[PDB]
Ligand binder design. Sequence first.
Ligand code: CHL
Ligand code: CLA
Ligand code: CLA
Ligand SMILES: CC1=C[C@H](O)CC(C)(C)[C@H]1/C=C/C(C)=C/C=C/C(C)=C/C=C/C=C(C)/C=C/C=C(C)/C=C/C1=C(C)C[C@H](O)CC1(C)C
Lengths: 210, 229, 213, 217
Amino acid sequence: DAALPSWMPGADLPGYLNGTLPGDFGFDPLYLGQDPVKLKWYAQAELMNARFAMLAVAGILVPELLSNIGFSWPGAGVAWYDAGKFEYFAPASSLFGVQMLLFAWVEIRRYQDFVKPGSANQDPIFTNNKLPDGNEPGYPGGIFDPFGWSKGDIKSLKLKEIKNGRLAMLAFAGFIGQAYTTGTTPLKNLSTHLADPWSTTVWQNDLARL
Amino acid sequence: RPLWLPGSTPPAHLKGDLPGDFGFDPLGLGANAESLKWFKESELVHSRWAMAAVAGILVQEIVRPDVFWYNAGKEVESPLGPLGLLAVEFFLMHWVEVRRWQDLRKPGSVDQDPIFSQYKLPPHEVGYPGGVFAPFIPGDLAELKVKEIKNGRLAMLAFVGFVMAAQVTGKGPIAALQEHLADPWGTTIFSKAAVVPGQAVAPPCKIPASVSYKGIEIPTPCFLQGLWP
Amino acid sequence: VRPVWFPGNPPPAHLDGSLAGDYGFDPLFLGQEPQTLKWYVQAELVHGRFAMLGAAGIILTSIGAKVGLGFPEWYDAGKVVVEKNNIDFPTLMVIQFYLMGWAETKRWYDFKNPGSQADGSFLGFTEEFKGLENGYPGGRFFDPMGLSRGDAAKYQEYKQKEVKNGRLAMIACLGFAAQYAATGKGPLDNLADHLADPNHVNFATNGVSIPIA
Amino acid sequence: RQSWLPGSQIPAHLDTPAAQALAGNFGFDPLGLGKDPVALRWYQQAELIHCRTAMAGVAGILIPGLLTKAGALNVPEWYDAGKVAIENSFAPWGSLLAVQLFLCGFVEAKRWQDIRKPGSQGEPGSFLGFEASLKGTSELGYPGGPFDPLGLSKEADKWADWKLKEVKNGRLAMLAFLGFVAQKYATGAGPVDNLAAHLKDPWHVNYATNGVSLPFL
Ligand code: CHL
Ligand code: CLA
Ligand code: CLA
Ligand SMILES: CC1=C[C@H](O)CC(C)(C)[C@H]1/C=C/C(C)=C/C=C/C(C)=C/C=C/C=C(C)/C=C/C=C(C)/C=C/C1=C(C)C[C@H](O)CC1(C)C
């Protein structure tokens, strides 16, 4: 509600969005972050869902692109939605069991910081090890920023993080929809479009499926 | 001030400020200020669209006589399929229409190029973007604002003529003028239709009822055929 | 002074010429009590506005049937639509009571409490549901062109035309039912027959309206 | 003031500040059942227990049902699950119900006595040292303590929102159970089938075409 960037040039934006969070373009048509305590939780949520979505999309597209090329390895042409039934060294169940244990420790360590900032910046075992005092929930830094990037224009870097994440979160949503609708991998869906974009729009595809 | 009916008193709301104000508002549709502000833009948009369509339909008939404008949608064939063409049109018009609309809702809030910060339209009026959209002005702008509305009101009435002529004669604008010029006494609508207390006679629709296009069958109805004279 | 329904007879006291279409007609004093008169005002407007849409619907579909456009007669349209389009009557009827129910209940509580539907309770909409007058809910949804909020005299004249055209349509819909019941034909079939023979084809010769004829 | 019916007259007994302190107060009591404050307090407790039981039961009918529809589960329909479970159980239904009434009655009696006098179950020396935790909070129907293991009720800036979600989700689950009973008697199928069938042809598959709900049309 000032002169900060807007999702719709000329609109009256919500005052609660004041440009303190990265990517504050005043977009809250349903007035969800109007309450400050909800907005505080939603900021971390958006950052967490974005950071996993960014890793996911990378780990979904890179292997497919390598598969198209001559790159050889166990996965090869394994479709992301078919990776679960793939046979690995250990039973899925076992792996999941380990994953939930390992994550219980890290999530509750991250959650402790969020509820009390700077309360989990110390190594439980090697007490001497720790994270620099200056810390905000969602931005642990220290050994999580091993190259010092945070030191430079941190605000621009945080905006690049939120922007790339929102696109990744939308990409994953695409992968889910396009996979269930076109029943094929994303880079295959892109090849179909690049071959004949005009005749390969969701409109025509869904019309044919009707 | 010239009026639509010489010797008449114009509506109180129609003073003479707007271009094309000949004191014509019999139903009082423009007595509300905020409503007049919308209808003024609507008249301009309708005028410019109609002027281009009447120009295009006449030129298309000269350059492409074999193709009847009414049958162009089904006849025109391009490698960009109907859907591909429509998608592109939908996105491009959504952007331009929203940008123009926001100008009406908040004047001066959409004069800046969203990609290049160095380019912004100078302060202007709704309906008259100017700036890059007006590279040359051959004469007084006020006079051309009258020429634009007058040429637009005529074009808007011409298109409606092209449509009804197409449904009553099955021919493009020029082909009709020629039919009329061949036999004016037997080509007017009066010489094509007649209703008297005893009976009713109306020209038949000359437009097929449905068109077959890419295995869809598009409904193609005549306009208020039941109420046709 | 104001033209009355029975020239020479004084207008009733509860009728002071303030309401649109006030010709002092209330022989049974049914609107003698004010609040009751306000309710009957909305009733006549609601009945009249539906009759105007009804009459215009029957006249157009009757014209399309008179010509060869395949429009069913008004008394046969309900079955044609459901049959040709395989529409489930029960579903359509319940959907109608859902939509009408919502709109009617909101209009009802506006009558009970004027302006009470402009609190933003409905999707945050406030001014479009405040209401200008009893039976006249202007705003930007119901009066999208602002004819009620521009030229007070034009608004009064339009109200007179609305009530008179609504009372005419209400009389015309009673005529469409009586004529169908007495003749078994459509309305524009009845007009063609009369126009053909106005002295020998009328109600006096229909064999039903006057039993001793 | 939010209203169940915009423009309607809200009962004065629901506009009183104490009544407004109650979660889900949309001014709905057309029959005037809660005019008496003492009754309004009992009915608020009754609504809370119905809400929390309906939410647990409906979750135990829908969630398993959707998982079975997918395949992740093979649970029987809710209306057939008793027979299936008792078929291979260690006990007949009567013995299982007798044990249920004993254990439920005990905890229901303690909750009851807490309504008659809030904080009474903390009577020192009444429960081998647990009575200290058996005392609820200042709000009846919100015991917290051991019943709030994660201490979410300790955040005063989120208390009201949490209670509103519990009442609204509870009122929805209560209506979803009534719907499960009505739809079972009118269809002869389960709630997940009823949903799929309607979604296939919503205009021809509904309660207006069930041949029971509307015997007049
Ligand atoms: C707890 C009981 C309760 C009851 C009995 C009512 C009853 C009523 N409320 Mg009310 N309300 C209630 C709670 C609440 N209301 C509101 C907020 C409102 C508002 C804002 C309004 C009402 C209105 C009304 C009336 C609507 C009249 C009508 O014909 O509607 C039936 C109309 C319908 C459209 C039916 C709805 C749909 C139908 C059930 C089928 C749904 C089909 C869909 C396809 C669903 C598909 C979903 C999928 C796609 C995801 C009505 C008497 C209206 C009124 O008249 O106010 C004067 C109104 O404007 N209520 C809230 C929130 C504050 C409530 C509770 O929290
Ligand atoms: C940045 C996200 C993103 C991107 C780049 C794409 C890209 C593509 N999608 Mg898609 N999709 C997305 C998200 C996305 N999608 C989401 C969130 C959904 C809903 C779950 C879908 C559901 C979907 C379906 C059902 C289909 C596609 C299809 C396609 C392909 C061409 C057909 C098409 O355009 O359909 C239309 C796609 C949309 C209308 C989604 C809008 C794009 C999102 C919202 C981005 C917003 C626009 C913004 C300017 C960013 C543009 C991208 C940027 C890199 C320039 C194409 C390569 C078609 C296909 O598979 O081809 C074979 C197809 O049928 N998508
Ligand atoms: C609303 C205006 C309008 C519309 C909807 C159409 C529509 C059509 N014209 Mg047409 N035309 C118009 C104006 C218009 N014309 C004008 C003003 C002229 C005079 C210059 C012509 C001259 C003309 C000729 C000679 C022919 C057509 C033809 C056609 C038909 C197929 C050709 C085609 O469009 O392929 C694709 C068109 C293009 C690829 C050109 C792209 C558009 C240009 C390059 C950009 C201009 C943008 C402009 C500034 C935007 C403002 C315009 C305004 C109306 C909004 C088609 C139905 C052809 C036909 O009849 O086919 C049977 C044909 O022979 N037109
Ligand atoms: C407020 C008011 C006021 C005014 O004044 C008046 C009036 C209106 C009257 C009122 C209203 C009221 C109402 C609406 C009520 C409703 C209720 C309900 C529905 C409940 C439910 C309720 C419900 C509930 C609890 C539920 C429960 C359930 C459960 C446990 C479950 C169980 C189970 C399961 C899991 C599964 C299996 O296999 C089986 C079984 C065994 C079955």
